[PDB]
Amino acid sequence: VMTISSLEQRTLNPDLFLYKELVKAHLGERAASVIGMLVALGRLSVRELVEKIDGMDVDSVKTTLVSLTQLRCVKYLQETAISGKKTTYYYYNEEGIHILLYSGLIIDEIITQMRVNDEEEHKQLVAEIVQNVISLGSLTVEDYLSSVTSDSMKYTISSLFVQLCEMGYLIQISKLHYTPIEDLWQFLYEKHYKNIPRNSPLSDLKKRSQAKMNAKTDFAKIINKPNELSQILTVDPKTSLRIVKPTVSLTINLDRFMKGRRSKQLINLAKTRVGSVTAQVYKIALRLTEQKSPKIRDPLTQTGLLQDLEEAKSFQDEAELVEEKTPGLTFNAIDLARHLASLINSHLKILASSNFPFLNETKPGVYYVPYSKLMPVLKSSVYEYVIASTLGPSAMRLSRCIRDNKLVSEKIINSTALMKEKDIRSTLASLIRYNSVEIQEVPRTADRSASRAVFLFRCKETHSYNFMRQNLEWNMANLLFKKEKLKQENSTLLKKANRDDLLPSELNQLKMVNERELNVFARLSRLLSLWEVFQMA
Amino acid sequence: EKAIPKDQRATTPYMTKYERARILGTRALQISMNAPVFVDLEGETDPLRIAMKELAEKKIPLVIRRYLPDGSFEDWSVEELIV
Amino acid sequence: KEVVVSETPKRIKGLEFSALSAADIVAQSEVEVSTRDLFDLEKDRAPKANGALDPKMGVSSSSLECATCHGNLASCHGHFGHLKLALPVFHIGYFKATIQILQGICKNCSAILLSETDKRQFLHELRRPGVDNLRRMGILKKILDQCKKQRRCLHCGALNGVVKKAAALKIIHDTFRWVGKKSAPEKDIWVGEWKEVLAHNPELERYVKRCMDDLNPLKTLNLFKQIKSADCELLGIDATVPSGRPETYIWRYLPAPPVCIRPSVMMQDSPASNEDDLTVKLTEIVWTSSLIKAGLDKGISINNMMEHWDYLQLTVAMYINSGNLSGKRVDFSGRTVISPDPNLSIDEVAVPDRVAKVLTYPEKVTRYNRHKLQELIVNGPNVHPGANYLLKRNEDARRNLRYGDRMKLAKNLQIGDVVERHLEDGDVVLFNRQPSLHRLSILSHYAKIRPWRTFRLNECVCTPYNADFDGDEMNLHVPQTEEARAEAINLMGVKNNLLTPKSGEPIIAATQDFITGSYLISHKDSFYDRATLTQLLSMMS
Amino acid sequence: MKVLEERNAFLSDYEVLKFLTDLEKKHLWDQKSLAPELQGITRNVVNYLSINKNFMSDESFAELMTKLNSFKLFKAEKLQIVNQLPANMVHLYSIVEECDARFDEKTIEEMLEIISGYA
Amino acid sequence: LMISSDAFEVDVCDKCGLMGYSGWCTTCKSAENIIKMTIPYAAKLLFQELLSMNIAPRLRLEDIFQQ
Amino acid sequence: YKGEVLGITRFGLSKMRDSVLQLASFEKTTDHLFDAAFYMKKDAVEGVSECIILGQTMSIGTGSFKVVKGTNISEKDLVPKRCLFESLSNEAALKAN
Amino acid sequence: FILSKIADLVRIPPDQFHRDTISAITHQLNNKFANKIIPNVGLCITIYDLLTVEEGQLKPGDGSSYINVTFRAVVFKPFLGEIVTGWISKCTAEGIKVSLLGIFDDIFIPQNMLFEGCYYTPEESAWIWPKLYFDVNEKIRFRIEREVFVDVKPKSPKERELEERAQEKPPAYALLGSCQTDGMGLVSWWE
Amino acid sequence: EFPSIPLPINGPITNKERSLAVKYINFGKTVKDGPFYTGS
Ligand SMILES: [Mg+2]
Ligand SMILES: [Zn+2]
Ligand SMILES: [Zn+2]
Numbered sequence A: 001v002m003t004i005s006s007l008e009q010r011t012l013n014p015d016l017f018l019y020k021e022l023v024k025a026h027l028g029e030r031a032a033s034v035i036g037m038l039v040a041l042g043r044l045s046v047r048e049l050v051e052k053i054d055g056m057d058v059d060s061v062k063t064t065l066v067s068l069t070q071l072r073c074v075k076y077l078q079e080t081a082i083s084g085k086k087t088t089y090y091y092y093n094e095e096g097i098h099i100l101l102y103s104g105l106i107i108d109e110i111i112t113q114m115r116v117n118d119e120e121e122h123k124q125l126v127a128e129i130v131q132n133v134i135s136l137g138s139l140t141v142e143d144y145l146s147s148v149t150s151d152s153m154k155y156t157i158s159s160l161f162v163q164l165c166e167m168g169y170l171i172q173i174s175k176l177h178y179t180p181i182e183d184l185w186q187f188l189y190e191k192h193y194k195n196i197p198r199n200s201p202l203s204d205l206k207k208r209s210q211a212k213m214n215a216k217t218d219f220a221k222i223i224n225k226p227n228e229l230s231q232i233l234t235v236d237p238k239t240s241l242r243i244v245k246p247t248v249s250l251t252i253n254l255d256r257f258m259k260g261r262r263s264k265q266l267i268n269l270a271k272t273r274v275g276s277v278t279a280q281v282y283k284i285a286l287r288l289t290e291q292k293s294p295k296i297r298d299p300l301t302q303t304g305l306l307q308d309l310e311e312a313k314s315f316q317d318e319a320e321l322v323e324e325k326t327p328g329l330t331f332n333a334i335d336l337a338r339h340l341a342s343l344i345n346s347h348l349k350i351l352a353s354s355n356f357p358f359l360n361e362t363k364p365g366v367y368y369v370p371y372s373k374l375m376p377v378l379k380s381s382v383y384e385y386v387i388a389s390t391l392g393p394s395a396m397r398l399s400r401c402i403r404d405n406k407l408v409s410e411k412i413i414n415s416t417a418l419m420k421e422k423d424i425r426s427t428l429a430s431l432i433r434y435n436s437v438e439i440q441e442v443p444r445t446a447d448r449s450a451s452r453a454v455f456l457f458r459c460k461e462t463h464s465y466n467f468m469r470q471n472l473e474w475n476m477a478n479l480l481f482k483k484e485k486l487k488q489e490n491s492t493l494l495k496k497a498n499r500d501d502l503l504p505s506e507l508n509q510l511k512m513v514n515e516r517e518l519n520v521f522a523r524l525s526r527l528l529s530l531w532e533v534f535q536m537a
Numbered sequence B: 001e002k003a004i005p006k007d008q009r010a011t012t013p014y015m016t017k018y019e020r021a022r023i024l025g026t027r028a029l030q031i032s033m034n035a036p037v038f039v040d041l042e043g044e045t046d047p048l049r050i051a052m053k054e055l056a057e058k059k060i061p062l063v064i065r066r067y068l069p070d071g072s073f074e075d076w077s078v079e080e081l082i083v
Numbered sequence C: 001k002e003v004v005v006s007e008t009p010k011r012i013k014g015l016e017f018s019a020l021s022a023a024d025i026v027a028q029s030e031v032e033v034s035t036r037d038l039f040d041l042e043k044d045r046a047p048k049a050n051g052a053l054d055p056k057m058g059v060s061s062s063s064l065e066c067a068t069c070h071g072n073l074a075s076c077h078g079h080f081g082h083l084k085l086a087l088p089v090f091h092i093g094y095f096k097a098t099i100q101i102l103q104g105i106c107k108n109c110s111a112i113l114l115s116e117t118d119k120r121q122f123l124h125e126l127r128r129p130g131v132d133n134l135r136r137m138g139i140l141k142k143i144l145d146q147c148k149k150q151r152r153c154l155h156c157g158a159l160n161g162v163v164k165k166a167a168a169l170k171i172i173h174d175t176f177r178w179v180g181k182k183s184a185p186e187k188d189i190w191v192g193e194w195k196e197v198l199a200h201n202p203e204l205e206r207y208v209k210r211c212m213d214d215l216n217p218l219k220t221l222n223l224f225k226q227i228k229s230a231d232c233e234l235l236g237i238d239a240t241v242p243s244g245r246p247e248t249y250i251w252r253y254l255p256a257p258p259v260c261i262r263p264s265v266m267m268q269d270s271p272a273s274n275e276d277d278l279t280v281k282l283t284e285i286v287w288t289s290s291l292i293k294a295g296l297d298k299g300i301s302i303n304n305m306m307e308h309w310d311y312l313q314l315t316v317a318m319y320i321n322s323g324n325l326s327g328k329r330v331d332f333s334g335r336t337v338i339s340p341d342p343n344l345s346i347d348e349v350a351v352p353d354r355v356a357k358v359l360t361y362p363e364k365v366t367r368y369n370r371h372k373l374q375e376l377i378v379n380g381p382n383v384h385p386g387a388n389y390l391l392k393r394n395e396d397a398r399r400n401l402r403y404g405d406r407m408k409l410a411k412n413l414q415i416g417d418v419v420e421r422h423l424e425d426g427d428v429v430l431f432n433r434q435p436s437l438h439r440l441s442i443l444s445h446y447a448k449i450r451p452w453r454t455f456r457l458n459e460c461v462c463t464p465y466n467a468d469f470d471g472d473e474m475n476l477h478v479p480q481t482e483e484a485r486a487e488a489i490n491l492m493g494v495k496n497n498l499l500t501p502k503s504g505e506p507i508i509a510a511t512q513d514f515i516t517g518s519y520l521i522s523h524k525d526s527f528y529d530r531a532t533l534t535q536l537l538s539m540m541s
Numbered sequence D: 001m002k003v004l005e006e007r008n009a010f011l012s013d014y015e016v017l018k019f020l021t022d023l024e025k026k027h028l029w030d031q032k033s034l035a036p037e038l039q040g041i042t043r044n045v046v047n048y049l050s051i052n053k054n055f056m057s058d059e060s061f062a063e064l065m066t067k068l069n070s071f072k073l074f075k076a077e078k079l080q081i082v083n084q085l086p087a088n089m090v091h092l093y094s095i096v097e098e099c100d101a102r103f104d105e106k107t108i109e110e111m112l113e114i115i116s117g118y119a
Numbered sequence E: 001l002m003i004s005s006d007a008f009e010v011d012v013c014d015k016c017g018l019m020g021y022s023g024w025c026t027t028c029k030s031a032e033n034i035i036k037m038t039i040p041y042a043a044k045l046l047f048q049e050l051l052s053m054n055i056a057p058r059l060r061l062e063d064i065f066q067q
Numbered sequence F: 001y002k003g004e005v006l007g008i009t010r011f012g013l014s015k016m017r018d019s020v021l022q023l024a025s026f027e028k029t030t031d032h033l034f035d036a037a038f039y040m041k042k043d044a045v046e047g048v049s050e051c052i053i054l055g056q057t058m059s060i061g062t063g064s065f066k067v068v069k070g071t072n073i074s075e076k077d078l079v080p081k082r083c084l085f086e087s088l089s090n091e092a093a094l095k096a097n
Numbered sequence G: 001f002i003l004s005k006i007a008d009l010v011r012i013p014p015d016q017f018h019r020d021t022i023s024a025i026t027h028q029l030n031n032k033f034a035n036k037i038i039p040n041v042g043l044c045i046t047i048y049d050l051l052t053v054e055e056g057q058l059k060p061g062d063g064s065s066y067i068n069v070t071f072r073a074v075v076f077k078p079f080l081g082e083i084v085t086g087w088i089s090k091c092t093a094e095g096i097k098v099s100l101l102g103i104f105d106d107i108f109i110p111q112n113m114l115f116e117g118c119y120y121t122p123e124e125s126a127w128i129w130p131k132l133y134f135d136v137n138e139k140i141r142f143r144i145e146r147e148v149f150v151d152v153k154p155k156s157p158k159e160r161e162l163e164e165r166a167q168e169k170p171p172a173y174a175l176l177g178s179c180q181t182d183g184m185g186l187v188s189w190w191e
Numbered sequence H: 001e002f003p004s005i006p007l008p009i010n011g012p013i014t015n016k017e018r019s020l021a022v023k024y025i026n027f028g029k030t031v032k033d034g035p036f037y038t039g040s
C-alpha cells in the first residue's frame, strides 16, 4: 500500500519503456501505442497492428506510420511468399529513436565545430536549419527557402550549407536506411548463390567460401555510398560560386556523429596520464581525424554471423588492416597536427609511451591511434569509476583485484590491503547483485551441496557491461516519465500562457517548476554522456 | 447473429423432450410469480400441474430460439411445434 | 439529487491465466509481515498483532473484528499479505519452464540463439487461426530441439552447451561436452586460468576437476531481465500484457494467504490456541529471511550464507508442495433404510411423516394458493399439513412459525411472501443410492406421507437401483425451485425412463415374486370360477 | 445508460406544456382530482411554465410561427424569442444578437408591436 | 450444486478482473468497474488457492443480453 | 479424431481440452496449473465441467437453446409521433443565408 | 428542454403481463428516469415515445422479461440560457443563488463578472445603487455562462467509517452565469 | 522512503549549461507544434 516510491513500473517494462517514453513526449499518444507493439512483438503488418491495438483502425494506423517514417522511426521491408501476395512489413528503428533521444546534443556539437567566424552566424543560420532537419526529417533546399520573403541574404545559408556537408553530418536521404540490416544481407546472400550453375561439390558446399566472400565485396559499396560522395559534392557551375546540388533532399547521419561523440570520452581518458596542453594537442590531432575513422560496429557482423570461428577471427584481423591502410588518416605527421616543431613531437612521443592503448603502433615515426585495441580499456576505465563514485573506493579496489588475477580464491583478498571478514565479505554481497562477482562453487560431494564446497570468484565480462547498460537505460526511462507526470499540473498553466505572448503564489508555482523542469534535462545530458560508452564496442 | 426467416427454417418441426421440460418449467416459474393464466382451471395448486394443462391446450405465449453453432436464430414458435 | 443507477446481467466468458508480477502482489496486499514472526503475545488476551496473522488480514475468531471490512468470521472474504524476500529465490513449480526457457537462450548475450529465417518460419507457423494445445506444444518442441542442436550463437562470439539439472534444485550448465580442437578464444583463457589457479596453490583444486559452473538464481534473474519483449512468443510467454514476463516466475515477493484459508482448528476453547502448519512454515520463512538480511547488514564468516539460502530455497519449495472423492454438501436431504411396498405406484416413494416435516419446500403465494397457505400457516409446524418458516415480501426476516406470531400472521399474507411448507402428497422428489453406477441410479418420484420411519418403495423399480434390500440405505433430495422440479419429473422421472440406454432393453419391469405369481395363474391346470375370478379382478385394481 | 444522439430535436416550451397537459389525462387529473413519485415534477412544471401567461394559444402559436418567416435569423434565437418577449421597446437591447448592427429602431418597434398585440 | 449447496455473492471487476470485498478492487483503487454477481464458494476457495501461489486466474465478463 | 491414436491416461487428456479446471480433477496435480499459467492459455469457458465450477449453465442437454417471450407489438404503435415540431424551424433558417 | 434518444434494457416482472407492452415499458422507464440526474446529459423529466423494441429475452434464474428499448427522453438542459424566470434561493457573503422552482435549486452566480457598481454588506440586507433594488421574493432574470459536470466518484470502504462517526457535494448538473446587460436583472425594471 | 544509502552522486545542482536544456525544450515544443502530432 501507499505506492509513492514508483514501484509499479519495476517488473513490467525494461528496454521498451524508454522507447515508449521518448515518443510519448514527442509524437502524441497514438505513436506510443504502435511503437509499444513493434518492440513487444517483432515484425507485423498493417492489419496485424489493427487486430492487436484494439482501439485503432486502418485509418488510424496508416496515419501514424507516415509520421514515424518521416522521423525514420520505422523500417520498411516489402517481401512476398513463394505463391505470391506481396505485402508490406515494418520493423522498429532504434536510430530514429536515438535521434529523438539526443536532439539538442546534436546541436551542441554542430555549433562548436566551425572556425574563426564565431558568434555572428551560429544563432539563426545553422541553428535554425539543423533543428528543422532533426524535427521535420528529410528536407530539401527549395522547400525551405520559400519560407523567407525577399531573400537578399540568400547565399549566406549556402556557405554554411556547403561547409557542413563537407566534413560529415548532412547526407543523401534514406534510400538504404529504411531497409533493415538482416534482409540487406539475406537478399544478398541468395542473389549471388542462385546464379552459380551446377558444378563439382568439393566437400559438398564450397560456395560458403566463394559466394559469401562475393557478398562481402558488395557489402563494401553499400555502406560507402551514404558517406562522403562526389555526386552531391564538388559541383562547379560556369562563372559562378561553388555550390552543392540543391534539388534532392538531404538528412543527417548518425554514423559520423557517434564517432565524433567518442572523442569526448577519449579526451576524458586524456585527462588521465597527461596534463592539459598535451591533452589539447592530442585533442586537435584527434579532431583532425574524425570523419574518416572506422565507425562503431558495421552491419557486416551485426547480424547474419552464425559464429564461424575462422571468419570471426579474421574479421578483427582485417579491421587492423583497415586501420593500417587508410587514405590519409595514418598520416599524423608534424605538418598535419600543428597547423589545423620538436616540442610537439616530444609530447607525441609521450603519447606513444603513455601506455594506455592510444597513439601506439609506430614503426617509421608517423603515428596512429589504435581504435580497436582501446575499447576494452575505454569500457573498463569508466566502469571502475562508477562503483568508486557510487558504492565505494574499497569496492573498487576489490573489483579491480578480482581482475588483477583470474579467479581469485577465498583467502587471497584478505592477504591484500585489508584484514579479513570485516567488509571484504560484506561488499561482495553488495556486488553479486550487480553481475560483477559471478560466484562459482565446486564441491567434493556427490549432490553439489554448499557446506562441503569452495567458492571461486571470477569476474566474467559482458555481464557487468550489459547490466549497467540496462540500468542506465532504465534510469533514463525513469527520468522522462516523472517529467511528463509533473506536466499534468501545468495543463491549466502553460496552455493558458499563450494569450499574453500578478498573483505572487504563481511565482512559487510557475517560475518554481521551470528550474525543476530544467534540472532533469541538465542531468539527462550527463546520463547520456555516461551511457554511450557501453554501445561503442 | 443473423436471424433465419420463417420460410428458410431447416431444423426439425417436432418438439424435443429437452425443450418440452424447459418451456414447462419456465411457464411454471412465471405462474408462481403471479402471472395471468389462459386456461379454464379447476381449483388447485402446484403451477407445474396447471402448466401441463396449458401445454396440452397449446396456449403458452413463448417461442423457442434454437441456436446453430455460428448464430442462426431460427424463431420456432411454440404453437408450431407438435408432439 | 441522485443519479441513474444502471446494472446489467453479466456472466463469465473466460479465464486468462497468468502469473503475478512484483507489483501485482504488493498491489492486492494489505500489510507486509514487516520482518516479524513472534505473533506479539502480550498479557491481555494472548492476542494477534502487526507483523503476523493480524486483523488487517482475515479473522478466525468470534471476537476480534477485521476492521478493514467490519465483519465477523462469516462476513470476511479474506485479505492477502505480501512478503519480501532477500536474495530472490528459484521457483519449484516453474522448474521445467525455467529449464525450457534457459535451453533456448544464449547465456552471454541473453538472446535467442536461433537464426533469422528459421525464426521467421516458426513465427509464421505459430500464428495460424486454428491452433490447438497439442499443435502448439508440438511447434514449441520443434523449436526447442532445433535450438538445442545449435552450438554457436549469432549476436556474440560465445560458445553454448547443454543446461540440465544436477545429477536439490540446482541448475547446471555444460559449456564443453566434447574434446574438439576448434580455435575458440574462450577455452585458452579457461585453461590458462585453471593452470594459474593450480600453480598458485595446489591445495584447493587438486582433488577433482570438471564438476561444472554454477547457476545462481540471482544470476539467471538478471539473465531473464535482459532478453527482449519480442522473443517471448518463441518461449511460450504471450507478453503483450505487462502482467506476466519471463522473469516474473522467480520468487521475489510471496503472497501470504488470508486467515480464512488457514483457520484455527476447533480442537480448542482452551487458551493459547493452535494454528495450522502453513502459518508455521511462513513464520520460518520470515525467520530465515531475517537471518539473510542480518548477513547482508554486516559481513559474516563462512559459507553459511549460501547454505542458509539453499535451505530457504528448500523451505519455499516445501511450502507449496506436499483425490476425486465425494465433496459437495447439499441442503434438504435425508438418508434412510428401504422397505418393500407393492401397494404403491411405480412413480411413487412413500416418505414418513418424521422426515417430511423438516424437509420443506419454498412456495410463493399467488392468486391460486392463498386459500390453502392460510390454513397451512394456521396448522403450524407440528401438525403435518403445515409450515416451518416464512419469508416476507420486503424481507423483514425469516419468520419461523414457532415463537409467537399466531393465526393473525396468516391473515395478512402479502402476495410476494414465501412460505416453507412441509413435504406433502404429490411433491416431486429425487431418490438415490450411493454406489451410483449408471443413469438409472438416480430417478425421481412422487411423495406419499405414511407411518413407520422408512423409505419404502415398489419392487418393479428396485432393479435399476440394484436393491437387494437386507438393511440398505438410500438418499433422498428435494428440489428447491420451480424450474429444477419440472426437470426431475419430465425427462428424469420413472415413467419416462422405462428403458436402459445401454441397449434399449427394459431394465425396470416385473421382478422375482411377480414372475412366480404369474406362472401359477397362467399355468394350464388353473380353472377359475366367479367365486374366485371376481375376487382376482378386484384384487388387482 | 448509452446515448445515441445528444443534440436531437430542439423543442419549444409550449410543446412540453401541451405534452404534460395531455400526460395527466391518461390517468386521474391534477386540478380536477385535487379536491407514484413522478407526478411531483408533472404538477410542478405545468405550474411553473404557466407563470408568464398570466395577466386558444395552439393555433395562435401556429400563426405566430408562420408570422416569424418575415426576416431571417439563426437557429436558436427564434425559439428564444418565441418563448419570451413581453414586448416593450427595450427588450431587443438585451435579447437579439449583435444588438446595434443590422436593425433600425422602427423595424424592431413594429415587430415588438406585433408581439405585444399577440400576447 | 450451486444454489442449495454453496451459494455465495461476490464482486469482480471488469478491468484486471480479480475480486475484492463489496465496494473496492484493492488493485484498481478507483473502483468503479465493480460488478456484483453470484458464484459457488468452492470456486472462491479455488481462486484464492491459485492466487496464494503465483497463478492469476482472471475472470473475464460479458453481459448475457446483447441481441 | 486428432490424427493419431492417443487414449485416456496421464499424458492422454491433453487432446483438445484447454479446460485447466477440468484437467485439475486428475491425479498427479501441481503440474498442469503451472504450464497453463506459463504458456498463458486463453481458456474460454464452454465445457460442462468448468460451468459447474463457475456456476454457469451447461451448453448441452436442456441449456442448448433459449426461450424468449414475444412482445406481440406492431409497427403502428412504434411510430415517431410528431405535431408542429420542426415544421417551420427548419424553414426559417435557409431564407437567403 | 431537449429531446435526447438513448437506449437501455429494462425488466418487466411476470405480474405485469396483464397490461400491454407499451404501458408496461413506459411504467418501468419512469422508475429509473425520474428526478435521477443523468451523468453529463442533464436531467430527464418524462418519456416521450419509444421505437425499435426487440423480443423479450429471459435468463432462467429470474423468469421476468428483459426488453432492450430505444426511447426519446425529455431532458432539461439549456445550452446557453438567454433568460431564466426563476427567483431566489439564499444570500450569503458570496454571489446570489436562485431557484428555477419546481424541479431543482442549483443555479449560482459568483460575483466576478457581474455589475461592478454593486456590493454586498454583511448586515444580511443587500442594497445596491449604480434607482430601485433587486432583493428577495422576485423573479431574477439572467444569463447562463459556464456549465461543468462533476462526477459521482466513489469512496473507500475503510474511509466510510470516518464519514459515519462525525457526519456536502453538489450534483452533476451545475449551472452558472453573469449579469452585465443593462436592464437585465428584474422583470419590472422595464414596462 | 525505504532507501537512504551512500551517495548516488553525479547528481549535483550547479547546471552551468542552462541554454542546453532550453534547446531541448525548444526542440520539444517545435515537435509538439508540428504538422503531424498523432495525439490522443
Ligand atoms: Mg444388500
Ligand atoms: Zn476481513
Ligand atoms: Zn549470445
Ligand SMILES: [Zn+2]
Pocket: E013, E014, E015, E016, E017, E018, E025, E027, E028
Ligand atoms: Zn481490477
